[PDB]
Amino acid sequence: NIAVAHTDHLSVVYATMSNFMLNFTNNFSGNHATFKPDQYVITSPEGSYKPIIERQGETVDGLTIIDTSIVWPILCQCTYPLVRSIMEE
């Protein structure tokens, strides 16, 4: 019931967001078996070493931990313009 709203609408939103100016990283290549993110550092002979990607545990921003249960409201507690009288701009 919900799939057309994903594939035929939300996917377009991903395709555009992917070209946004600030989405500068390559997040994934679609191959779980081999994909590994590119890893850069600011670094100097004076000995500074700043990784761009660090493992720092939960942060104040709250973006770090992932509740996968978010999957549930989506499948069974959300309307969409394509899925749901049924015309909607």
Partner: peptide, 8 residues
């Protein structure tokens, strides 16, 4: 179409 449209 979609299952939704058909049902409609």
């Amino acid at each position: 179409l979609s299952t939704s449209q058909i049902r409609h």
